[PDB]
């Protein structure tokens, strides 16, 4: 395969790009790192002899090369705006999981709905929330947002009950045939979400 | 035309301002004294309204041809910019949540955080051009800003890194950028909001 994902045996920052690859029928190899790198971190991603680091770099690159970055330049910017919002919330989530889980979790969950609402609002403005997060075609931001929502449902079950378009969106994206099969597969299910047992 | 809405600080708008100025563009500053993510900057390009400084950088990158020569370079641009923003998130967290008790450790770790950019320059035409390829990209403006604010936080932080040192000098000497960097519109704004730097 021309694609290789080098990462810890976790879903982590590779979950979204993996969903993307699975859903667009792409083949890739997984290289596992048990407990060199430009920024001293994984994921590392190979596409032929191109070596990328940074999960969002990988998403944008797949977004550009597989046509999942909007239909024009304005949509592409909106895709970025969504992904940057997803990543802002991910940065807080990761800090929680890895540096303040037991003490911060109740404060984090309190603030959660106000950090989710912006995505509900975006959906409500795009064809009634019935298609994708931007435009009428799936983008890399949809896979990343989907992941973010899936991992938050585990952290704070019901956190989407207050948000009907986000709820239906998750169920709708999750039932895409190729993606539904992947999320059910051992390759996905048998990895933990993070690398410290907390979720 | 362009509108930038933001506080009277350099902050997250400094890079995209350097870009606009250096690319000979005109824009309106709407100074706020207090949205999609409850956050600024807000940016207007005609009917289009963007939030998030890196979204604004990528947009201008796309529309002005500052995003590499091809898809491979575009990915390397993103890689650099994402690395710049990882350190910027650290920097910001220091400034606002732990300046006086964190500063020592931050600066000790700083050479390790800068070296990857020296290394990238070293692997690209001997560090004599830009951070990726042969043309300036939105990532150059962002990295330049990171480097300027870090020279204020920890003067001499670049002495150990000749390619990055020459790079700041070269880019800073570009005519329109040089004029903008010397201007009161830049000089007379604080870097951050809480008066720490
Ligand atoms: Pt962060
Ligand atoms: Pt982070
Ligand atoms: Pt941050």
Swiss-Prot record, chain B:
GO terms for molecular function: dinitrosyl-iron complex binding; fatty acid binding; glutathione peroxidase activity; glutathione transferase activity; JUN kinase binding; nitric oxide binding; protein serine/threonine kinase inhibitor activity; S-nitrosoglutathione binding. CDD domains: GST_C_Pi, GST_N_Pi. Keywords: Acetylation, Cytoplasm, Lipid metabolism, Mitochondrion, Nucleus, Phosphoprotein, Transferase. GO terms for cellular component: cytoplasm; cytosol; extracellular exosome; extracellular region; extracellular space; ficolin-1-rich granule lumen; mitochondrion; nucleus. The keyword Lipoprotein does not apply. Gene3D superfamilies: 1.20.1050.10, Glutaredoxin (3.40.30.10). The modification N6-acetyllysine is found at residue 115. The modification Phosphotyrosine is found at residues 2, 186. Glutathione binds at residues 6, 12, 34, 39-40, 52-53. It comes from the Eukaryota. InterPro entries: Glutathione-S-Trfase_C-like (IPR010987), Glutathione-S-Trfase_C_sf (IPR036282), Glutathione_S-Trfase (IPR040079), Glutathione_S-Trfase_N (IPR004045), GST_C (IPR004046), GST_pi (IPR003082), GST_superfamily (IPR050213), Thioredoxin-like_sf (IPR036249). The modification N6-succinyllysine is found at residues 90, 103. The modification Phosphothreonine is found at residue 49. It catalyses: RX + glutathione = an S-substituted glutathione + a halide anion + H(+); prostaglandin J2 + glutathione = prostaglandin J2-S-(R)-glutathione; prostaglandin J2 + glutathione = prostaglandin J2-S-(S)-glutathione; prostaglandin A2 + glutathione = prostaglandin A2-S-(S)-glutathione. SUPFAM superfamilies: GST C-terminal domain-like, Thioredoxin-like. Changing residue 92 to V: In allele GSTP1*B and allele GSTP1*C. Residues 70-191 form the GST C-terminal domain. It is found in: Cytoplasm; Mitochondrion; Nucleus. Its EC number is 2.5.1.18. One of its GO terms (biological process) is nitric oxide storage. Residues 1-68 form the GST N-terminal domain. Homodimer. Interacts with CDK5. Belongs to the GST superfamily. Pi family. Conjugation of reduced glutathione to a wide number of exogenous and endogenous hydrophobic electrophiles. Involved in the formation of glutathione conjugates of both prostaglandin A2 (PGA2) and prostaglandin J2 (PGJ2). Participates in the formation of novel hepoxilin regioisomers. Negatively regulates CDK5 activity via p25/p35 translocation to prevent neurodegeneration. This is Glutathione S-transferase P.
